[PDB]
Design a protein around this ligand. Sequence first.
Ligand SMILES: *[C@@H]1O[C@H](CO)[C@@H](O[C@@H]2O[C@H](CO)[C@@H](O[C@@H]3O[C@H](CO[C@H]4O[C@H](CO)[C@@H](O)[C@H](O[C@H]5O[C@H](CO)[C@@H](O)[C@H](O)[C@@H]5O)[C@@H]4O)[C@@H](O)[C@H](O[C@H]4O[C@H](CO)[C@@H](O)[C@H](O)[C@@H]4O[C@H]4O[C@H](CO)[C@@H](O)[C@H](O)[C@@H]4O[C@H]4O[C@H](CO)[C@@H](O)[C@H](O)[C@@H]4O)[C@@H]3O)[C@H](O)[C@H]2NC(C)=O)[C@H](O)[C@H]1NC(C)=O
Ligand SMILES: *[C@@H]1O[C@H](CO)[C@@H](O[C@@H]2O[C@H](CO)[C@@H](O[C@@H]3O[C@H](CO)[C@@H](O)[C@H](O[C@H]4O[C@H](CO)[C@@H](O)[C@H](O)[C@@H]4O[C@H]4O[C@H](CO)[C@@H](O)[C@H](O)[C@@H]4O[C@H]4O[C@H](CO)[C@@H](O)[C@H](O)[C@@H]4O)[C@@H]3O)[C@H](O)[C@H]2NC(C)=O)[C@H](O)[C@H]1NC(C)=O
Ligand SMILES: *[C@@H]1O[C@H](CO)[C@@H](O[C@@H]2O[C@H](CO)[C@@H](O[C@@H]3O[C@H](CO)[C@@H](O)[C@H](O[C@H]4O[C@H](CO)[C@@H](O)[C@H](O)[C@@H]4O[C@H]4O[C@H](CO)[C@@H](O)[C@H](O)[C@@H]4O)[C@@H]3O)[C@H](O)[C@H]2NC(C)=O)[C@H](O)[C@H]1NC(C)=O
Ligand SMILES: OC[C@H]1O[C@@H](O[C@@H]2[C@@H](O)[C@@H](O)O[C@H](CO)[C@H]2O)[C@H](O)[C@@H](O)[C@H]1O
Ligand SMILES: *[C@@H]1O[C@H](CO)[C@@H](O)[C@H](O)[C@H]1NC(C)=O
Ligand SMILES: *[C@@H]1O[C@H](CO)[C@@H](O)[C@H](O)[C@H]1NC(C)=O
Ligand SMILES: *[C@@H]1O[C@H](CO)[C@@H](O)[C@H](O)[C@H]1NC(C)=O
Ligand SMILES: *[C@@H]1O[C@H](CO)[C@@H](O)[C@H](O)[C@H]1NC(C)=O
Ligand SMILES: *[C@@H]1O[C@H](CO)[C@@H](O)[C@H](O)[C@H]1NC(C)=O
Ligand SMILES: *[C@@H]1O[C@H](CO)[C@@H](O)[C@H](O)[C@H]1NC(C)=O
Ligand SMILES: [Cl-]
Length: 968
Amino acid sequence: LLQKYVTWDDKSLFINGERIMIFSGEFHPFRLPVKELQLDIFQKVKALGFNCVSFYVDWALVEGKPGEYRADGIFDLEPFFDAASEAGIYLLARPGPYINAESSGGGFPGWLQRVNGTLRSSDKAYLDATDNYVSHVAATIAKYQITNGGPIILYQPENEYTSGCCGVEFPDPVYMQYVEDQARNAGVVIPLINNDASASGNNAPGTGKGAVDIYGHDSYPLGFDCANPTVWPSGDLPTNFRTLHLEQSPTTPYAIVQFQGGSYDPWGGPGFAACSELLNNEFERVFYKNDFSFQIAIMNLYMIFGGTNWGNLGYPNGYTSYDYGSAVTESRNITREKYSELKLLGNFAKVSPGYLTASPGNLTTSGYADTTDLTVTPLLGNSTGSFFVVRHSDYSSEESTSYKLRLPTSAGSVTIPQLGGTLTLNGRDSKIHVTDYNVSGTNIIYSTAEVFTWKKFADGKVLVLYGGAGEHHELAISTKSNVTVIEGSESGISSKQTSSSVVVGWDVSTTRRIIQVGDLKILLLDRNSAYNYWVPQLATDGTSPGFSTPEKVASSIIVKAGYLVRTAYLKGSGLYLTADFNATTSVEVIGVPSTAKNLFINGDKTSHTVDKNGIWSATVDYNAPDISLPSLKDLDWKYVDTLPEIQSSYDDSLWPAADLKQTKNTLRSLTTPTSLYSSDYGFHTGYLLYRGHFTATGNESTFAIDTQGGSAFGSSVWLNGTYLGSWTGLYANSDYNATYNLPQLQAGKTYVITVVIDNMGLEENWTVGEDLMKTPRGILNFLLAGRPSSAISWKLTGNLGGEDYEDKVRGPLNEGGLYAERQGFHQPEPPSQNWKSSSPLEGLSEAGIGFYSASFDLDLPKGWDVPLFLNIGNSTTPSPYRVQVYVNGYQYAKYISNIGPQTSFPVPEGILNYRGTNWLAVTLWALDSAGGKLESLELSYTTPVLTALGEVESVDQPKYKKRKGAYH
Ligand SMILES: *[C@@H]1O[C@H](CO)[C@@H](O[C@@H]2O[C@H](CO)[C@@H](O[C@@H]3O[C@H](CO[C@H]4O[C@H](CO)[C@@H](O)[C@H](O[C@H]5O[C@H](CO)[C@@H](O)[C@H](O)[C@@H]5O)[C@@H]4O)[C@@H](O)[C@H](O[C@H]4O[C@H](CO)[C@@H](O)[C@H](O)[C@@H]4O[C@H]4O[C@H](CO)[C@@H](O)[C@H](O)[C@@H]4O[C@H]4O[C@H](CO)[C@@H](O)[C@H](O)[C@@H]4O)[C@@H]3O)[C@H](O)[C@H]2NC(C)=O)[C@H](O)[C@H]1NC(C)=O
Ligand SMILES: *[C@@H]1O[C@H](CO)[C@@H](O[C@@H]2O[C@H](CO)[C@@H](O[C@@H]3O[C@H](CO)[C@@H](O)[C@H](O[C@H]4O[C@H](CO)[C@@H](O)[C@H](O)[C@@H]4O[C@H]4O[C@H](CO)[C@@H](O)[C@H](O)[C@@H]4O[C@H]4O[C@H](CO)[C@@H](O)[C@H](O)[C@@H]4O)[C@@H]3O)[C@H](O)[C@H]2NC(C)=O)[C@H](O)[C@H]1NC(C)=O
Ligand SMILES: *[C@@H]1O[C@H](CO)[C@@H](O[C@@H]2O[C@H](CO)[C@@H](O[C@@H]3O[C@H](CO)[C@@H](O)[C@H](O[C@H]4O[C@H](CO)[C@@H](O)[C@H](O)[C@@H]4O[C@H]4O[C@H](CO)[C@@H](O)[C@H](O)[C@@H]4O)[C@@H]3O)[C@H](O)[C@H]2NC(C)=O)[C@H](O)[C@H]1NC(C)=O
Ligand SMILES: OC[C@H]1O[C@@H](O[C@@H]2[C@@H](O)[C@@H](O)O[C@H](CO)[C@H]2O)[C@H](O)[C@@H](O)[C@H]1O
Ligand SMILES: *[C@@H]1O[C@H](CO)[C@@H](O)[C@H](O)[C@H]1NC(C)=O
Ligand SMILES: *[C@@H]1O[C@H](CO)[C@@H](O)[C@H](O)[C@H]1NC(C)=O
Ligand SMILES: *[C@@H]1O[C@H](CO)[C@@H](O)[C@H](O)[C@H]1NC(C)=O
Ligand SMILES: *[C@@H]1O[C@H](CO)[C@@H](O)[C@H](O)[C@H]1NC(C)=O
Ligand SMILES: *[C@@H]1O[C@H](CO)[C@@H](O)[C@H](O)[C@H]1NC(C)=O
Ligand SMILES: *[C@@H]1O[C@H](CO)[C@@H](O)[C@H](O)[C@H]1NC(C)=O
Ligand SMILES: [Cl-]
């Protein structure tokens, strides 16, 4: 339409005039702010057989001060795009402005709490607020479009523009047209795709003003209750998606822009381990092949890698981890069985062009399989091949089921197995059986076992098939050649020739068989062996794979290995592999180029042998080095009191006055004389402090206060030095009403009420018109008994400077309003010479907030990817306390002793300096009159990985420097 690089028809996208199935994974650059590790993820995604990544940009992190766009350093999108290009991964850009994403504000900066207009509407005050952000981020995206030689192929305007309320005329075509035009005016010419939250046809082609180019929708059919990870409720597997597609957008490729790849988890939830169990390998093979049954041509998994809600970037209901239960874990490992299962499907799609040109039919409980206990969805092609997606009719069934197939083929209709036996579907599994499947001119008439990959090499063709344990399978090939078993036993392998075919039966075994039919070799694997195979693209013109184009797909090799194979290239007489290892690994290479005489693994020449069938073999030894981690309790811990506000000498004369008589918040008008909403004064993040001055009559008895921080927030209150009490917090409370008893006061004396409030983040704004992102933080009501409300004059602070935030490197959300944070003491090399020697393990003996500093050295070996974790102990029921840990100035843990569940906090290399000095700053807030302390504080590691990753450069880590704007 505006360019010829990315086009489409009813069946699929075309990239440079060639059909491609887009298999994508969601990855948010702001949740892993280390550019070398961004390349790591992209390479792990490419190794799944995927060709695409989808990303959000978080407006709240890049325009913290209105009118100042800052996507630099750790927030630079450009190295992220270069990493995607280097890995050979196309991009779906989703800059918002609204993203939801379990992020603070759903992407919106807290200054949108002062916008006189409905958020996500055609109100001029909202639209004007978005212009600076979109014109920047969309210009940066424009520069990296595929039209300019970059990786970006699709653009999403808005996010799930689906639900409206409260006087908005939803859907507003003027609003969506405006959002689309902002992107176009910045230079975006690639297609626009939306992501309707349900299949509701919103903004579909043909709806006129506000219509996108390709209609997309989302689906989370298993929901977000990770507490019952084995429960698959009846009727939750979608069945009508293709029907809906043909009613809502028949002229565009069927697209699911967010399909479930995991789940979020709230404060106090079951943990992301439970989420990984619910959305495990069984979920993937059943639910993802089900999406294939609808002829999905654009499929994006939310999330593929989740990362970390570091520096308060997350929404209030979520905690620091955003592991998501996804295929790549928070610490970047690919140990989960769901990664390996996903790789099998991803590699199937990469090499099966007939999948896109076939004609999908409706699901059937008879006609294809000989029992109604199975359902079969046919995708019928003629010369280009057919596909048959098999599953249990009751999709949750764990039963083992025997069956036979009746499949049409170019050689006639056939009942399978022809040579005896039955097929088996064991429990929560699904299969894509194929007919007339093209392997570079050799026709596979049928195969019951599933295709992992195939390639044409100079010496012949190779096909890799797999089945689960206990399965009997069968295939037939259009040929007059006979079959020979060239590796493994002939036991269990049966065969027969007809006048123009050969038929082969086999039982799945843990030992590989290789059969040969003419110039076709066929690997017959069990699923668990297939998990260990990889299909890197073979570069001959450099070291980089390139994108998944037809030539570069065709020119790939097959590698059996272990943990990971990243890349492969041919240079002279050398075949080079880059790979990672977590155990001693037997490496095999199938389809070695005829010119190669030497094998290199991670730059090192490696002995190989060649077997009778031309397969190269080598061993890579794994010998983990000594990982020597310092004992965090034995460090030279220095303490400073980070609540000096409750000392009677404290002078708050430089604090901002909370003296606005009118709020600028349209959602909730004031119920106090002046606004005590933090965002009215530009404070949107971290701990908030309020100070209320009054002169006592002497007859004051109680002080009531409604505080609001979001779900699981807490607050504590003091009258001068006297602790009044705390709200210790519950996930179920986003606000709380407390009445505290005052001590006897002296008539005529001045007192100051100090209130500390945990801002858990700003709410999302999922429903258009509800304006829930405007939900204020701070003090909603107060009453000093027998005194008018105007008797208290309030001061407040959050992060120093508010929207004129101090730390341009670490961004606008990283630090809150504690004294120690305002002073910059959380950064490397604080002025702690003359501070007291005390540890968070000793802690506090009364209510309050302590600040702790220590350094430690790491000297971990080069060439190893070693995941490190901060651990906070909770082996027995604790007193209520709250902790933040800053690592070299970056907040990478937020902890609530009484709510949880996170005790283990991954911190990536780059934030940590693996061969240098590191700084921990810990805040301990005891919401208890007896005080509190840490049970234990420990640095740990998991399996070291012998890695191909280059050196991880440390991100910028500005050291402590005195701040003139501070209140001292
Ligand atoms: C180096 O990197 C390697 C990757 O390259 C990495 O290797 C991977 O390691 C992970 C573990 O970290 C492996 O995943 C696990 O695999 C377990 C072993 O079973 C696998 O292998 C068997 C053959 O050797 C197969 O027979 C088996 O298939 C069968 O079971 C499948 C899943 O249940 C099923 O889909 C198949 O159809 C078939 O029936 C399988 O492939 C596996 O048992 C384990 O399963 C569970 O764990 C998951 C959560 O992590 C859940 O998603 C899943 O539902 C299972 O949960 C159960 O077990 C948990 C304990 O681990 C409990 O927490 C759960 O509550 C639940 O427990 C119930 O059921 C249990 C069995 O009855 C029992 O414990 C209880 O009684 C309870 O009722 C998991 O998927 C992965 O396969 C490896 N990948 C490769 C490629 O090898 C290696 O670890 C790395 N090394 C180092 C040192 O870091
Ligand atoms: C250190 O160790 C200690 C000791 O082991 C740990 O302390 C324990 O921490 C538990 C987890 O925080 C805590 O359990 C909680 O207790 C409260 C009540 O006091 C309860 O509300 C919690 O259950 C809900 O919330 C969680 C999410 O936080 C959900 O996963 C769960 O399904 C429940 O959800 C319901 O309420 C939510 C909000 O109200 C809703 O969003 C949700 O949809 C659902 O609502 C429906 O049901 C409600 C009734 O259940 C009802 O309001 C309505 O009908 C709704 O439809 C959870 O049980 C333990 O109390 C605590 N134990 C002790 C001995 O202190 C500590 O966490 C550990 N720390 C770390 C760091 O690991
Ligand atoms: C792949 O990535 C995922 C996500 O990043 C990794 O999964 C996380 O792994 C960590 C580390 O194993 C895990 O945290 C542990 O959970 C255990 C509960 O299931 C806890 O028992 C354990 O705490 C103990 O060990 C710590 C040291 O590691 C101590 O500091 C801590 O105080 C606890 O130690 C006490 O208890 C143990 C035994 O109970 C005893 O031996 C000690 O002496 C002491 O008394 C950790 O909290 C997370 O739960 C995992 N997160 C998720 C979401 O799954 C996974 O490990 C990565 N895999 C690889 C191979 O890298
Ligand atoms: O990680 C969750 C994911 O949710 C997506 O949105 C919503 C979900 O929150 C719910 O309210 O409705 C539908 C179905 O569950 C779902 O699309 C959202 O687009 C993402 O940004 C995430 O928040
Ligand atoms: C099979 O692949 C070959 C080689 O790429 C191609 O020339 C041929 O047209 C394909 N056949 C069918 C029926 O799609
Ligand atoms: C085909 O191969 C099978 C197994 O090796 C064998 O039984 C059969 O005799 C062969 N057929 C011919 C015609 O050689
Ligand atoms: C209470 O503390 C303030 C400063 O926070 C101080 O100026 C005032 O004198 C104190 N009042 C009493 C009665 O000690
Ligand atoms: C928003 O603007 C209207 C119209 O000018 C005005 O009446 C109202 O007071 C404003 N509200 C806020 C909260 O600023
Ligand atoms: C002091 O407060 C008490 C309790 O509210 C009230 O009964 C009494 O009248 C008050 N005394 C004075 C002197 O104002
Ligand atoms: C606190 O009181 C206010 C005003 O009376 C009320 O709106 C709110 O629901 C109360 N909050 C809780 C958590 O009870
Ligand atoms: Cl200060």
